């Protein structure tokens, strides 16, 4: 009956708001203090929402979801009957429980250390290391270091957890759990989808990847690049060469145009991280968007403690499910960096404040893509060179190609370099799930994508043991990444329509949409919807058509790309990396 679903989906969301919360603040007392207590306290928490979860998948498969009438009932009882790794026996459940905490911790403490003195971490050290060091051979201690570190000690868990987490999702009607994590998007097309819009990126990406590679050249020397081959991938300013911008001094297209030190700039002028998402705060509110509460600035973690504590530091928003406490968890730097960082995690917070009303069920994004992009769309508008003058980090650029070509290249080498990265984490991780990749080649056919995709090769070879993926935050933490690819076309759609919406006329990547009314509605209706409806309802909410699309992506960097060509041709580049074989002979 009706009626009997209705009640059902009101008793599973009057206890859900309880249940996801006490589980919430023991995930969030383990992430900012990483212990023995509470990571028992933790492990005990799982085992409670564990039954929680249990209980009501249970209930809710003895009902047939395509004979009911309401849909949004329909589809609160077909998520509810997933119970993920819930469905394991209880032996099964705990070993995959403590295999992820382990995963996690392990790569949240992990230390490079030189011999004679100082131990380093991945945040702020390493980090750092790859953003400034301009030698080789530092560069390659620190990206060896740390895969050798994370990485090698994260493979001892990996085989276990894949049969695991594949286990819970065949459990669940699923074939494997990269099926699983792909049902997400509610798209039977999806790998085409995303497949046609990596290749419509390829001219822009190759590009940009034969012009970088030139630059590398004229900096590392001839002897250490092979202009016909990939480019070693720890020279690319980041630790997973997942976006290039800190590189932009060695590849800046007009010199006699140079940018202030924003560094310098925000550090001179007394810039806290504080500051940085009072800053964001202020952007949503000037859109008409929600602030946050009070009680966001009281409990977030908005730098890394000066307290001995251990803390996971990848950045990251939470929602507690009461619908008024918000928390981001960030090992804030001060930098420009940090500052995109820091909207985008904004983005995640005000998404939880436009859907706190739906029932718990339907929280979350119309697509985990949708949930990533608010705040990078905010960014966008941030970052322009317009933008960051009327916040002092950079004096006047305006009117000046040179400036315009910089801006771009600047915007390109995190945009455009991150496209391929992001495609290639779950095509792995995907074929680990479906067992075309077995631990046999788990590393090997890593490095295969890594080529194949992205262009780059390995620095130093890699023996039997290494695991790099191990190496990557997302991978022992088990998050899926494929979100962050969609993120980062959609963002571009959006940022157009609201643009559009805000009247403004000429190239798109001069536009910021600070202070649009007209921009802010746009994103409210659709971020209200929250999972209520298919996405593509969302999209044609703030963008009037219903796809993913990369032409708005196209569009924003086309002066680049007609500005790349012509330089390439004229230094005579083979686009690719033909001689794919090729590796540093050193
Ligand atoms: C299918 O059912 C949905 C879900 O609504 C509800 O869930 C059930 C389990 C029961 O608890 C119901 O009592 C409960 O309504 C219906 O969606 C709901 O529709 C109503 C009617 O418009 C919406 O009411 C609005 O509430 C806001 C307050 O924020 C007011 O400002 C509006 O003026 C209006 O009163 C309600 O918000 C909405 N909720 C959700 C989650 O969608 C839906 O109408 C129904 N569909 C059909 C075809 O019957
Ligand atoms: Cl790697
Ligand atoms: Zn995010």
Redesign the pocket.
């Known amino acids: 009956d009706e009626a009997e679903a209705?009640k059902f989906?009101?008793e599973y969301d009057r206890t859900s708001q309880v249940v996801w919360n006490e589980y919430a603040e023991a995930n969030w007392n383990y992430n900012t203090n990483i212990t023995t207590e509470t990571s028992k306290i933790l492990l005990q928490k799982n085992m409670q929402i564990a039954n929680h979860t249990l209980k009501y998948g249970t209930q809710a498969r003895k009902f047939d979801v395509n004979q009911l009438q309401?849909?949004?009932?329909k589809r609160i009882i077909k998520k509810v009957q997933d119970l993920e790794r819930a469905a394991l026996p209880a032996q099964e459940l705990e070993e995959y429980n403590k295999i992820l905490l382990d995963m996690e911790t392990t790569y949240s403490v992990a230390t490079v250390c030189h011999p004679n003195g100082s131990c380093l971490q991945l945040e702020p050290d390493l980090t750092n290391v790859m953003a400034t060091s301009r030698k080789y051979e530092d560069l390659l201690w620190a990206w060896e270091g740390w895969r050798d570190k994370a990485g090698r000690a994260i493979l001892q868990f990996y085989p276990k957890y894949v049969e695991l987490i594949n286990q819970a999702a065949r459990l669940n009607g699923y074939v494997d759990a990269g099926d699983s994590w792909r049902s997400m998007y509610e798209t039977p097309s999806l790998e085409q989808d995303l497949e046609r819009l990596f290749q419509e990126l390829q001219p822009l990406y190759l590009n940009l990847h034969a012009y970088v590679r030139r630059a590398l050249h004229r900096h590392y020397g001839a002897q250490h690049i092979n202009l016909e081959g990939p480019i070693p991938a720890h020279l690319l300013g980041n630790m997973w060469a997942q976006t290039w911008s800190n590189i932009y001094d060695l590849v800046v297209p007009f010199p006699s145009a140079p940018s202030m030190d924003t560094t310098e700039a925000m550090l001179k002028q007394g810039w806290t991280p504080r500051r940085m998402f009072k800053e964001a705060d202020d952007f949503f509110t000037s859109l008409g968007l929600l602030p946050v509460p009070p009680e966001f600035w009281n409990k977030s973690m908005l730098e890394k403690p000066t307290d001995g504590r251990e803390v996971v530091c990848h950045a990251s928003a939470w929602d507690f499910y009461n619908g008024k406490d918000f928390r981001i968890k960030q090992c804030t730097t001060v930098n420009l960096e940090d500052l995109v960082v820091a909207h985008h995690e904004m983005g995640h917070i005000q998404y939880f404040m436009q859907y706190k009303?739906?029932?718990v069920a339907?929280r979350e994004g119309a697509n985990p893509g949708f949930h990533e992009a608010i705040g990078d769309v905010l960014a966008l508008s941030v970052s322009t060179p317009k933008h960051l003058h009327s916040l002092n980090l950079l004096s006047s650029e305006g009117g000046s190609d040179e400036h315009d070509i910089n801006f771009l290249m600047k915007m390109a080498l995190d945009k455009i370099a991150f496209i391929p990265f992001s495609y290639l984490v779950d095509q792995w991780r995907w074929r680990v799930f479906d067992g075309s990749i077995t631990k046999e080649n788990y590393n090997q056919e890593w490095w295969s994508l890594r080529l194949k995709y992205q262009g780059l090769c390995p620095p130093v070879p890699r023996t039997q043991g290494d695991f790099d993926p191990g190496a990557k935050f997302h991978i022992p933490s088990s998050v899926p990444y494929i979100k962050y690819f969609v993120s980062f076309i959609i963002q571009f759609q959006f940022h157009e329509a609201l643009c559009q919406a805000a009247g403004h006329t000429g190239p798109l990547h001069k536009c910021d949409i600070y202070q649009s009314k007209e921009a802010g509605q746009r994103l409210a209706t659709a971020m209200k919807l929250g999972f209520?409806r298919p996405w593509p309802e969302a999209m044609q909410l703030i963008t009037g058509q219903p796809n993913m699309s990369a032409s708005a992506m196209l569009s924003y960097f086309k002066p680049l790309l007609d500005w790349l060509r012509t330089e390439n041709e004229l230094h005579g580049e083979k686009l690719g990396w033909p001689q794919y074989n090729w590796t540093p002979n050193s």
């Open positions: 209705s989906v009101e309401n849909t949004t009932i009303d739906l029932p339907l209520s």
